[PDB]
Design a protein around this motif. Structure first.
Motif, mmCIF file in Angstrom:
data_model
loop_
_atom_site.group_PDB
_atom_site.id
_atom_site.type_symbol
_atom_site.label_atom_id
_atom_site.label_comp_id
_atom_site.label_asym_id
_atom_site.label_seq_id
_atom_site.Cartn_x
_atom_site.Cartn_y
_atom_site.Cartn_z
ATOM 1 N N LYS A 188 -75.630 -63.335 -2.268
ATOM 2 C CA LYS A 188 -74.883 -64.489 -1.538
ATOM 3 C C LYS A 188 -75.973 -65.830 -1.091
ATOM 4 N N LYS A 192 -77.294 -69.050 -2.893
ATOM 5 C CA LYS A 192 -76.376 -69.889 -2.452
ATOM 6 C C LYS A 192 -77.226 -71.395 -2.132
ATOM 7 N N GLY A 239 -74.959 -74.699 -2.539
ATOM 8 C CA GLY A 239 -74.226 -75.581 -2.170
ATOM 9 C C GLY A 239 -73.554 -76.539 -3.483
ATOM 10 N N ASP A 267 -73.645 -72.052 -8.728
ATOM 11 C CA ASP A 267 -74.206 -70.956 -7.810
ATOM 12 C C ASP A 267 -73.794 -69.918 -8.236
ATOM 13 N N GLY A 268 -72.426 -69.893 -8.831
ATOM 14 C CA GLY A 268 -72.061 -68.588 -9.538
ATOM 15 C C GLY A 268 -70.983 -67.881 -8.747
ATOM 16 N N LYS A 269 -70.773 -66.626 -9.285
ATOM 17 C CA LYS A 269 -69.801 -65.731 -8.782
ATOM 18 C C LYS A 269 -70.215 -64.235 -8.878
ATOM 19 N N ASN A 306 -67.115 -65.990 -4.172
ATOM 20 C CA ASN A 306 -67.546 -67.194 -4.644
ATOM 21 C C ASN A 306 -68.919 -67.590 -3.956
ATOM 22 N N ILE A 307 -69.941 -67.350 -4.587
ATOM 23 C CA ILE A 307 -71.492 -67.602 -3.959
ATOM 24 C C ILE A 307 -71.441 -68.940 -3.101
ATOM 25 N N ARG A 308 -71.040 -70.142 -3.426
ATOM 26 C CA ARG A 308 -71.120 -71.342 -2.891
ATOM 27 C C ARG A 308 -70.267 -71.584 -1.938
ATOM 28 N N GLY A 344 -68.256 -68.961 -0.234
ATOM 29 C CA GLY A 344 -68.303 -67.841 0.579
ATOM 30 C C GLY A 344 -67.112 -67.086 0.576
#
Ligand SMILES: Nc1ncnc2c1ncn2[C@@H]1O[C@H](COP(=O)(O)OP(=O)(O)OP(=O)(O)O)[C@@H](O)[C@H]1O
Ligand SMILES: Nc1ncnc2c1ncn2[C@@H]1O[C@H](COP(=O)(O)OP(=O)(O)OP(=O)(O)O)[C@@H](O)[C@H]1O
Ligand SMILES: Nc1ncnc2c1ncn2[C@@H]1O[C@H](COP(=O)(O)OP(=O)(O)OP(=O)(O)O)[C@@H](O)[C@H]1O
Lengths: 115, 107, 109
Positions: free
Chosen positions: A81, A85, A87, A91-93, C98-100, C102
């Protein structure tokens, strides 16, 4: 106890190299990655609000698979993460699901020890 | 009972052809394969090398899992680096697109 | 079916019809998927006869969008009667991050 998990990240192709480095510090010894494609579907109004078109979009994506047992999942997902990260979307999952078994081929051992 | 499992093999791209024989002989009707990559991480400073691998995925229910894994185990082994590993997990449902079948019958 | 659950729907199939597929999945509410170009292998006991095909692979992780809606949309669009229609595999996903943003679980998708 002897639980094993797979952590699967799908993300844009960048800072993979920073990730490799931080995931190393925390106990990860090996991982798998592949180049694949992402696709964004959005609902959009056709002109005059007559109907709906699905706006399709295609991206290049990195997919990383990391099976773990002794390294805790919270620590992989949290460090990923962190280096990934930005913004902005792409950024993905991260997907976590569980592994019934792991087999080390060069050495025949099974279960949490084969990692 | 009618449990279905996915078996995921990540190994060097070699000996694929015999692994086919030995699997079709125990009832495997079709499989999926892709070329991926794998790398070791070490050490803190981290150094890592990257090799091409084959990702083989077989989904079974009738063919006993335990019979796939060790058919893969026996035939892919060489003791040298890059024998790779095998990841197995459980599948909730399979659907045959052509037949409409679901459950182990779909396979 | 049930709230909180997330599933990976995994389809391996012909390269064909992929675009009508995106159209329709997009409408039952799927906002993103991953696909890759893989290969299929066919085996037959005759010694064994072995074939090699080009197949497509689609991965979709869902929660708020019902899985029966995804599979049925796929049966429909992809089915042609002939072999190489391919299969769908479904499995449960413990968690999604969800990385962006959190977020975790269904709100992350
Ligand atoms: N729900 C999903 N199922 C399967 N693959 C996904 C999913 N979400 C994302 N991916 C993969 O991750 C890549 C990065 O997606 P990201 O997390 O940036 O989503 P997004 O398109 O920014 O926003 P959204 O949350 O609306 O999908 C995608 O291009 C796709 O390959
Ligand atoms: N924990 C893991 N997560 C994801 N993929 C893995 C994992 N371990 C091994 N693999 C895959 O299997 C391939 C074979 O690697 P190998 O068996 O040489 O791993 P290693 O741990 O580096 O070796 P060894 O276990 O002998 O120290 C790797 O390149 C990688 O693609
Ligand atoms: N059991 C399986 N495990 C993994 N991948 C599969 C499996 N069955 C099919 N696939 C993938 O989906 C593709 C489509 O195959 P399809 O569903 O048309 O089956 P088939 O090979 O025509 O006949 P059968 O019903 O014997 O599988 C295959 O070529 C393969 O890539």
């Amino acid at each position: 106890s002897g639980q094993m998990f797979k952590v699967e990240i799908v993300t844009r192709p960048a800072n993979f190299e920073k990730l490799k480095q931080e995931l190393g510090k925390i106990g990860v010894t090996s991982l798998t990655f592949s180049n694949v494609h992402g696709c964004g579907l959005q609902k959009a109004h056709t002109e005059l609000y007559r109907g709906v078109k699905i706006e399709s979009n295609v991206y290049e994506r990195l997919k990383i698979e990391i099976v773990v047992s002794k390294v805790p999942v919270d620590q992989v997902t949290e460090t990923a993460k962190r280096v990934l990260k930005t913004g902005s979307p792409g950024d993905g999952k991260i997907f976590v699901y569980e592994i019934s078994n792991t087999i080390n081929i060069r050495t025949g051992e099974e279960g949490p020890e084969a990692l």
